[PDB]
Amino acid sequence: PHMTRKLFVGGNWKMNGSYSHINTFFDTLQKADTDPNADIVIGVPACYLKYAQDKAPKGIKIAAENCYKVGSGAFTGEISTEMIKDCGCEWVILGHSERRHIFGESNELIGEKVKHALDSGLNVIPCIGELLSEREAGKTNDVCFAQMDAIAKNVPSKEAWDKVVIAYEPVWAIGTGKTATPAQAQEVHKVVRDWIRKHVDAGIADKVRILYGGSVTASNAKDLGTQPDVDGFLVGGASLKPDFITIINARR
Amino acid sequence: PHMTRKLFVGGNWKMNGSYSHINTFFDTLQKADTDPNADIVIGVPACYLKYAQDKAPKGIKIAAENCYKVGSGAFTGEISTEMIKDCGCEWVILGHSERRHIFGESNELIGEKVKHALDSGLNVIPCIGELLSEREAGKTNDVCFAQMDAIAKNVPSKEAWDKVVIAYEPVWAIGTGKTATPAQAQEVHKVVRDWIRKHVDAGIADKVRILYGGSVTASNAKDLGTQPDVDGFLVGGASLKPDFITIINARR
Ligand code: NA
Ligand code: NA
């Protein structure tokens, strides 16, 4: 169903976390039996990048939740690609709905960040997804296509897609409990994969992981994950809880 | 000239720094003879907060370069007041010109952040200052007054002003080499101090430190610092260099 696409389970702690929580959470994670064929990446606040990557069990990668679009400079409050690598980390989440819709990051800025992160040797999780008002207007695909256009035109090469994991999160499902049904997720992922097939490359479309995110839980992950164009999850609230282990083991 | 107001020397590394630079810089800082009657606070990228505060010599405080306006939650890419304290830090720079004019943070948002930081037990360095276009339009005081209004109405009590250090940085002086003259800095600081005297309290106006920032260097700091309403500096580019030591020792 998912061809040669390996399961990917992302977490995003958003603006939560502490040294105490990191110690406990990753002790539980190390003790637990997790699917050895899942890629696991957890986004954490920037002040915890190195500590959490040191404390993470082998195989688990830590992501920055954002970064800026140049290597260094006069950008108070920003985190650079080089600081992420200095902290021992290789992943960054880009274009999350909260950056776009609370902090006003544009498609152009997120595209610029995708290119700079890829050109710095980072792996990226670019986020796409539509507002409730956009879906009601019949613009779900239009919005996702414009977001994918900005991302895709900024992936510097065909090889670079090996370092890209797309996450689709309908904004109305993020933090609301109103999870997309397996049908709703599959429909959008198929449309996005077809877009990548047509506008980028058919080989790459077949290989690129596309995550569903937006109120993924331990009980709903299995049915979302068995959809053929859903390759895994980007988990918010539940990635702070032991439930994240169950979600990791959903395709097991 | 500066009454009972103690010298305050702030640094802002902006989007620069690394574990290697922190080690070297703070070895030089520990070895150097710094004015023992100066408060010294250095803003660093969030991924380095704990490390830099552990490595800083005694007496030197580390600041976050930004924070959000609530304690925790679904705010991808944000740093909270509680994470700053978890990293052993007590200071945050708020409303820096780069946040206002590159990342679109409004007066209302910066006011909300001042109140939340103060209500979390943090010390704050709220930043004010006018664009070149605003000074040419004759609006320098107007802009500073509106920014001070948002800050002042969000300082929860009279005691809380003990945890506030205002920094005035004309945007045209930040990173440009076009330092405000001692005259230009003194004129604005006097106007701002008078504003605090009239709109807040005369006691507080007498005690609150007001920093000048914007292309402060080792050679120009002395004359800026001897101005009676200039209580110290907020230093950008030069706080990455050994010159920061000379600036710290300018009022010596
Ligand atoms: Na580790
Ligand atoms: Na220390």
Author numbering:
A (entry chain A), B (entry chain A): -1 to 250
Mind quoting what the paper says about this structure?
Helminth parasites are causal agents of diseases prevalent in humans. or TIM-barrel fold composed of 8 alternate β-strand and α-helices. three invariable catalytic residues (Lys, His, and Glu). enzymatic activity, leading to the concept that TPIs are obligated dimers.
helminths, we solved the crystal structures of TPIs from T. 2-PGA at 2.1 and 2.3 Å, respectively. in the presence of 2-PGA (TsTPI and SmTPI) and in its absence (OvTPI). measured the melting point of TsTPI and SmTPI. and TsTPI exhibit a Tm of 75 and 57 ºC, respectively. illustrates the positions of residues TsTPI-S213 and SmTPI-S215. the middle of the SXD/E insert, whereas TsTPI harbors a lysine. stabilize the SXD/E insert in SmTPI and TsTPI. TsTPI and SmTPI harbor 6 cysteine residues in their primary sequence.
